[PDB]
Structure formats: structure tokens, C-alpha cells
């Protein structure tokens, strides 16, 4: 049994075509998370891993006007509760976004959250980036392997075997190794992008902007 709520949640999302509706229902209950950091990166934990929640402009407007005496970027070390939330896959640049892997990111879309300040959370293990976990990275690789195999089997069709004469009696033959490069998909660009999952599009608020709204 998976003890990390975030790991089990994110893994199921990747193991179900990035379709949140296909994710088990008994895991869609409100999340009680400890805030590890609030700025420059707002990171919450579940006692094992930390993830970066994405707040909708509505979730923020509700929080501001339901808890006006509370600054979100001042929630470090504070415990929050996410009542309304969803999950969705997004294509990202992993060289820039540390909360992702292999250019893929499972985002926690927050629609409603309340702060349970002054509530001491039970000590635990030091939280690590879920997207740096051995098994989770592997789960994401499986997802890409599936998409890669589907595309290659769709793109490469019929006979494409190197003619045996080309590798026989090759003593006087020379070739360029780039002859062995086969495109996995008809797509444009050096990066593989022929996935079949429905990429999320939920517009979220950038953390550096919730800072100005709250602290100029």
C-alpha cells in the first residue's frame, strides 16, 4: 500500500492516460498539506514528497476574501487544506521546471483551500521532490515508452529492413552513421511530441504575482 498520497495520486494519473476522471474516486477527498515553502516556490508536502500546487485565479480570490488577514506567501511552515482540486498533464521544459520530468508534469490544480494555522503537524521524514523519486521517474518513463511504441508502430510500416547487400562484403564500403536514424513520428521538431493524452489547459496564477497583490 502506497503511504504517500501525492505519489499514489500522481502515479494513477500517469497510469491512466493523464485522464483525471479515470483516477480512483476514493482518492479524491480533501488534502491536508503542510506548507514547506511559500516563496519563491510554494511547495506543499504529504509527509514524504513535496509538490507545487497551482492556484486558479478564483481559488485565490476566494482565499483573499475569506481570510483577508492571511498572506499566502506567508504560509511557510503553515498547514493548508485543499477542498476543491483536480489533476492534469502538461508538456513543459524540464530544464527550467524542477517539478517535472522528461518534459512532462502532473499539476495539482487548486480550486479552494483554507488555512488551519497554529495546528502542529506530526514530525516526519524529510520531504523530497516527487519528480526526483526513483519509482515515479520510472512510472513516467513507462508512460513515454508506451507513447513512443504506439507512434513508431504507426509511423514505421511495411518493409524497412536495411538491404543485406549494404552490410555484406562491406570491406570497400563506407557509410555515414546518420543513415541509421529513424524518425519516431511525422511531427515537426527534434523533440518527441506525438502523445495521445488530452493535455490540460487550466489557467493558473503565477506565484510572483500573488506576491504583488498581497505585498506590493
Amino acid at each position: 500500500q502506497q503511504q504517500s498520497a501525492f505519489k499514489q495520486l500522481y502515479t494513477e494519473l500517469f497510469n491512466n492516460e493523464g485522464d483525471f476522471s479515470k483516477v480512483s474516486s476514493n482518492l479524491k477527498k480533501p488534502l491536508k498539506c503542510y506548507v514547506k515553502e511559500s516563496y519563491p516556490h510554494f511547495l506543499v508536502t504529504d509527509g514524504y514528497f513535496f509538490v507545487a500546487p497551482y492556484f486558479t485565479k478564483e481559488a485565490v480570490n476566494e482565499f483573499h476574501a475569506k481570510f483577508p488577514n492571511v498572506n499566502i506567501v506567508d504560509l511557510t511552515d503553515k498547514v493548508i487544506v485543499i477542498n476543491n482540486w483536480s489533476l492534469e498533464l502538461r508538456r513543459v521544459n524540464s530544464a527550467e521546471v524542477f517539478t517535472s520530468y522528461a518534459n512532462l508534469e502532473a499539476r495539482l490544480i487548486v480550486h479552494s483551500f483554507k488555512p488551519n494555522l497554529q495546528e502542529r503537524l506530526n514530525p516526519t521524514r524529510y520531504p523530497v521532490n516527487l519528480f526526483r523519486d526513483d519509482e515515479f521517474k520510472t512510472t513516467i518513463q513507462h508512460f513515454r515508452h508506451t507513447a513512443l511504441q504506439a507512434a513508431i508502430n504507426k509511423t514505421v510500416k511495411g518493409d524497412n529492413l536495411v538491404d543485406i547487400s549494404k552490410v555484406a562484403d562491406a570491406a570497400g564500403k563506407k557509410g555515414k552513421v546518420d543513415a541509421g536514424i529513424v524518425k519516431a513520428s511525422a511531427s515537426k521538431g527534434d523533440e518527441f511530441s506525438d502523445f495521445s493524452f488530452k493535455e490540460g489547459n487550466t489557467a493558473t496564477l503565477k506565484i510572483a504575482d500573488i506576491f504583488v497583490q498581497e505585498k506590493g
Binding site: A102, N103, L148, I152, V156, V162, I164, V167, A168, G180, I181, V182, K183, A184, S185, S187, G189, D190, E191, F192, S193, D194
Partner: peptide, 12 residues
């Protein structure tokens, strides 16, 4: 890992 390529390796 991230590119749009697959590479031919032969067993002839």
C-alpha cells in the same frame, strides 16, 4: 530520451 528519433541496430 527526449528527441523524436529511434536508432537502427542490426543483427545480420
Amino acid at each position: 530520451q527526449l528527441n523524436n528519433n529511434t536508432y537502427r541496430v542490426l543483427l545480420y
